[PDB]
């Protein structure tokens, strides 16, 4: 109980700073955000993506609600977390640190599983509908929680140990241990290494999903929208046209466009066989349109123009009656895909940028001897690292509340429409 670098280890006298006020206001904000997000999410459910998001939010809310009153009661007696009850000495610190590490690892693992599922569904449709079910996907959160419990129970075995960080309240993983044993340093490096691997895997899955979605967007546009637009433009040209040669030229262009477009494929049911009924209805509509092109061509070869324009009008009628449904479904599916990927990316960047400094602190403070003052260089930096770790559970539901709120949902829809 005598150390120069962490001199707050045995100090039971807390400092009367503004730590309690900031802790209280941040806990209040976090609880308000958790409650509001769960209320906004309850009635929509009554997608595997959104049930995973709901499970993540429930785990976060349970963790915050469990850890806040302990610190509140420790501050209530205006003493440290070293001892609050005579029979529970030095156990409050261990419980606090164990739960904090447990919830951090569980949250990271659930974000990784969310991103992996999203990329897989956008990338491997056969494996998407082949194996996983929603009942099978509902049990990942107990699995992740159990694994986090298994990993964070290792310090109780003896390979690692927890230490108290001043003022009187924090408890966390021992970091430097006077450049001593390989046990504590091994635990710290293993922990930060696991977090680094998870962060890198999440970023890789995000990039793979973005590239696959970009590929689907390009394929859809080239296969259907250009052919649709040349059909519509040549219909306008015929409606303006006056001579038979121009009409025959325009109808040759439409024939090429319709044949190419009948070769296309909608973004949904890309796994489906070409003999599926929706595909046959797509093909049947284009067969009727091609036949009417042939009728107008036959009738315009004989020098008569008005009847060619009449058959063009019939083309317009069947075009609206048979074709628009698949195009509309295509674009709606694309917008939903972009929405889900945007939510995943905006959580990923936050997790990485708030989890980096502890990784840096454990990396730099492991392979380095004693240096610089141990009063404000170590302590302020460690308090900063702990604050950046703690920010995760506070701002996690709020950005989701901002994005899914219907008024800002429409505002972002207009923002996306603007370019």
């Amino acid at each position: 109980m005598k150390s120069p670098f962490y001199r707050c280890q045995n100090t039971t006298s807390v400092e009367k700073g503004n730590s309690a006020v900031m802790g209280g206001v941040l806990f209040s904000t976090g609880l308000l955000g958790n409650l509001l997000a769960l209320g906004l999410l309850a009635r929509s459910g009554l997608s595997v993506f959104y049930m995973l998001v709901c499970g993540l939010t429930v785990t976060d809310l349970l963790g915050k609600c469990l850890l806040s009153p302990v610190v509140l009661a420790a501050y209530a007696q205006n003493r440290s977390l070293r001892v609050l009850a005579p029979a529970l000495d030095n156990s409050l610190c261990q419980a606090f640190a164990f739960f904090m590490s447990f919830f951090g690892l569980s949250s990271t693992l659930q974000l990784l599983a969310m991103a992996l599922e999203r990329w897989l569904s956008l990338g491997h449709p056969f494996f998407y509908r082949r194996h996983i079910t929603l009942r099978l996907g509902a049990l990942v959160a107990p699995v992740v929680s159990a694994f986090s419990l298994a990993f964070c129970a290792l310090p109780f075995m003896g390979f690692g140990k927890f230490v108290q960080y001043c003022p009187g309240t924090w408890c966390f993983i021992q970091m430097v241990h006077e450049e001593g044993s390989l046990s504590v340093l091994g635990y710290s490096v293993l922990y930060s290494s696991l977090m680094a691997l998870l962060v890198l895997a999440t970023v890789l899955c995000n990039l793979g999903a973005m590239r696959n979605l970009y590929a689907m967007h390009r394929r859809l546009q080239a296969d259907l929208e250009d052919n649709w637009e040349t059909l519509n433009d040549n219909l306008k040209v015929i409606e303006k046209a006056d001579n038979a040669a121009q009409v025959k030229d325009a109808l040759t262009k439409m024939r090429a466009a319709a044949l190419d477009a009948q070769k296309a494929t909608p973004p949904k049911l890309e796994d489906k066989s070409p003999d599926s009924p929706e595909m046959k209805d797509f093909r049947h509509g284009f067969d009727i349109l091609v036949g009417q092109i042939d009728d107008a061509l036959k009738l315009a070869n004989e020098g008569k123009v008005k009847e060619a324009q009449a058959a063009a009008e019939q083309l317009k009628t069947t075009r609206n009656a048979y074709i628009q449904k698949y195009l509309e479904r295509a674009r709606s599916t694309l917008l939903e895909e972009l929405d889900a990927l945007l939510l995943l990316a905006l959580m990923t960047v936050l997790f990485t940028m708030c989890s980096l400094p502890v990784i840096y602190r454990a990396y730099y403070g492991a392979f380095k001897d004693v240096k610089e003052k141990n009063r404000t260089s170590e302590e302020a930096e460690d308090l900063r690292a702990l604050r950046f770790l703690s920010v995760i559970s506070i701002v996690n539901p709020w950005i989701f509340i901002i994005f899914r709120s219907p008024v800002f949902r429409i505002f972002f829809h207009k923002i996306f429409i603007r370019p």
Partner: antibody
Amino acid sequence: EVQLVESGGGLVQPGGSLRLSCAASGFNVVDFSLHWVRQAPGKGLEWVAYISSSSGSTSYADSVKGRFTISADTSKNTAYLQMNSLRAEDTAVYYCARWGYWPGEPWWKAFDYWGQGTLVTVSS
Amino acid sequence: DIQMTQSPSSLSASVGDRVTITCRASQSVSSAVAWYQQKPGKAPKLLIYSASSLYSGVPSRFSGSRSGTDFTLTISSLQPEDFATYYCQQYLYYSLVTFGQGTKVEIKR
């Protein structure tokens, strides 16, 4: 079996007339359209004319239109080409071919069956 | 009209080479392109009928490929009964049909 047979070619004077007869066997003319193609000595292929039996539709090339006439009759299962004001640039070998109907596989196979050829010589 | 240009003109090759002929369209005719073979004093024969599809009967060493408005006929290995003239055609409708120029393939010595 499917078979197309031509007839009616020979030596004609400039300004003379000739009649070519494409007779089909093993299938019905009523279910297919018929086309005439020609090849000059030392040169490549060239489409000439088109008849559709059911619709009555008829089309001719720009070197040919106004001087040839294609026709058919399904009672005797035959198609005809009539050549009227012949020049020395019309001496060639002439072939007859079929093409199926939309929709389906029959349209996407264009000229799967061809005739046998007949030589037309225009010299004074 | 829809012009369509063929290249080369007089390819020289030997038994076992891999031969490639290119045909080029002036418009988009979709994939409605065919390839024919002709011997001296005979009638043309169909090989590829939809820019990539093999007509029933011709051997499998002939292949056709589309990439935009550029079409490629490939003979992967050659046998003595492949020295002939080869033709390109587009067929978008009944009344508009255009052929290429032909590419005669000879023997190398």
